[PDB]
């Protein structure tokens, strides 16, 4: 026949598993039996399948339960194993790589029926994911038309196809987890975080979390991990398929509500988070209302958002350690426009060689950067109309 209606008596076996204290940890350790430690990952990913709730209002709304999560760290973290696993558990799963993703790639290929000779609208890898969970590799490495399907479904939470004969803008809503690596692939000690995560902090503003794997060389870690992989080899409570039916029941038949109690904490914490953004707090309920969809609570506990905020801090504890440093290219540009000014005063022409410029940049002080980034700052002047090229051998100064 092959290579699910819920029974009644194991539903109160679900609530029995609900009175069990460690279900928040427990089910998580049952999520990824293959992997050592990284419990905040099993934690989060647990709350990922319980993610959010539907807000349909009178109109508009539809912020859903949808949660993207990035994770990364030392190259080949066994991230691809959790992806290849969770991918399979799902009603609708999605997985691909970096550079194996683009704009044109995941939506509405609209190909001919071939054998009957008729063009018929096809669903791309994103339409099928609608509901459930997507997964991908190395968002630092995604192409430029990649992220162009992402900028599209993150918020629009829809997709627009008007081309050829037929017009539909059709919805896509699903939580997603992409694996990744730091640029290093070690992100190196200290350093600002943003550039180290690659990408600009504006593009990172949206992604609901940042998960950073790292390497402690604890002894005591790698032998403790070995003793994990020491098994199999041959030959703790861990429910197997009981968690899945609870994933079916815990999602629609529960309709969690933040009550009044949520605000006193969920709010006040956000000032110190801010002292963050409205995108983190955007999910400060979404992640906690994912702790709401947990436990079968239709009125959610006031104290959850502690470890929900903690799940946010998890990305933030990754920021404890470029475009997120304030001035930067701008202080460089005060000294740029001042160097160009003082040369315009000293030199009889509005122009100077970019060479004489960088000799007047990188050497004098160390907040004076390297040639191409001085050229990105003078690009940021050019895109400001604050420089003029005057042939590709020199650089003119802006004029009346």
């Amino acid at each position: 026949k092959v290579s699910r209606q819920i029974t009644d008596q194991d539903l109160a076996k679900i609530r029995e598993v609900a009175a069990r204290e460690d279900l928040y940890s427990l089910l998580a350790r049952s999520i990824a039996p293959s992997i050592y430690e990284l419990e905040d990952v099993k934690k989060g990913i647990l709350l990922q399948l319980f993610g959010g709730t539907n807000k349909t209002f009178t109109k508009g709304g539809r912020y859903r339960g949808d949660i993207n999560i990035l994770l990364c760290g030392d190259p080949s973290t066994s991230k691809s194993q959790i992806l290849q696993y969770v991918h399979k558990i799902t009603p609708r799963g999605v997985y691909t790589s970096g550079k194996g993703s683009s704009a044109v790639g995941l939506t509405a290929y609209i190909t001919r029926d071939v054998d009957t000779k008729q063009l018929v609208l096809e669903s791309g890898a994103l339409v099928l994911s609608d509901g459930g969970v997507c997964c991908i590799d190395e968002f630092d490495k995604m192409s430029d038309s990649t992220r162009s399907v992402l900028h599209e479904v993150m918020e629009q939470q829809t997709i627009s196809i008007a081309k050829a004969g037929i017009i539909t803008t059709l919805n896509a809503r699903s939580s997603i987890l992409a694996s990744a690596n730091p640029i290093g692939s070690r992100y190196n000690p200290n350093l600002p975080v943003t550039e180290n995560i690659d990408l600009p902090p504006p593009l990172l503003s949206r992604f609901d979390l940042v998960y950073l794997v790292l390497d402690k060389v604890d002894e005591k870690n790698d032998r403790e991990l070995a003793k994990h992989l020491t098994n199999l080899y041959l030959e703790d409570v861990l429910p197997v398929e009981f968690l899945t039916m609870y994933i079916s029941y815990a999602k629609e038949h529960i309709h969690p509500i933040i009550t009044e109690a949520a605000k006193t904490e969920l709010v006040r914490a956000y000032v110190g988070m801010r002292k963050a953004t409205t995108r983190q707090l955007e999910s400060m309920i979404r992640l906690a209302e994912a702790h709401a969809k947990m436990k079968l609570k239709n009125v959610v506990e006031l104290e959850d958002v502690q470890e929900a905020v903690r799940l946010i801090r998890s990305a933030i504890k990754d920021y404890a350690t470029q475009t997120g440093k304030s001035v930067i290219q701008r202080k460089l540009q005060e000294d740029l426009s001042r160097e160009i000014m003082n040369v315009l005063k000293d030199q009889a022409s509005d122009s100077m060689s970019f060479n004489e410029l960088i000799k007047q940049i990188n050497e004098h002080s160390q907040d004076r950067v390297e040639s191409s980034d001085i050229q990105e700052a003078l690009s940021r002047l050019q895109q400001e109309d604050k420089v003029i090229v005057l042939g590709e051998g020199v650089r003119r100064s802006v004029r009346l």
Binding site: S148, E152, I257, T278
Partner: protein, 394 residues
Amino acid sequence: SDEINELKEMVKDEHIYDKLVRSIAPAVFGHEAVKKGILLQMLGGVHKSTVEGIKLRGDINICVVGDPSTSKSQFLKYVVGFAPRSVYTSGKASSAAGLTAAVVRDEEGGDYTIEAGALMLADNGICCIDEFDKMDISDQVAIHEAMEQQTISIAKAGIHATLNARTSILAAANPVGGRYNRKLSLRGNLNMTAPIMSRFDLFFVILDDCNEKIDTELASHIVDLHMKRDEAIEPPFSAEQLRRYIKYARTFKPILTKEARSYLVEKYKELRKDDAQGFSRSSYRITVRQLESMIRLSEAIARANCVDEITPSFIAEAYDLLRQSIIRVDVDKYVSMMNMIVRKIAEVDREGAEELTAVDIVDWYLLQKENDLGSLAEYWEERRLAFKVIKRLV
């Protein structure tokens, strides 16, 4: 039917002007004036006449800007989640054509199949994009065909064509610094050209900042939005009745022929008397089109107040309303000499003393004088004149 009897009740009040304002997007908090335009965008303009000759605008346009996390996009889903026939895509990838036709080749079998693309049913509607940084520069003015001609012909060496595009295009880029960039004249703020820039009027900047009370107010109302409950806080206008009020307000063809448009001249005159210097200021100019824009504002102001022929007060609203977001852009020998005699102090005596010596005022001037002068002779009368007027005023 009987729902205009709802509308009479609504068209009585003075207060439905501010009501129509606080009643538009609950999903957004604050931001005020910008809200108006959104409505005024759904509301039509003249978009007609005067012969013989070309159709004048008409329409209206807004590109709202501010630091990401701004929650401006909440406006955009509000466009599509409220307005009729709304086309929305933010993407870089359309691609090019896009709102342009492809043209698709091979079809196959003789080919030249003309894609719409994108904006087609967008015609006579409010079109929306995000992040002009992310549509780059290539297509910038190619979607601007409709921003002047209001119609777009489309050329791949396909077959000769022109397309009815008549539409508002509203959008929001995230600023190229990600922020302000106070000092940025909005012209270099955008990373885009004045032809397509001056054309969309008006941009209406909003920078989003923290403030402690405000941090708690964002922790108040934005929270009430975060809230699943209470989501029970309501606007004075039921959304759909606002829509049917528009479908009623779309019937009006209000025209100020009124002689107090004479006042709009002085206003528009005094609109450019200020922008006159600097020309690196809000200018632009501001554009001759901004008079047409000045008009196309009160066009919708009329549908707002439901009476026609407008008034001095009505345009005053819109004029000052521009004036903020033009101020959001803000942060003949001796005619060059009495230019900078009061101009050096114009940029400096407010920001400082306007003091020290007489000749220092010459020295930063030998910087900016040499670049726009057209000879060595025009350099020297930028020298000996900056000497001659010094001993004139000394």
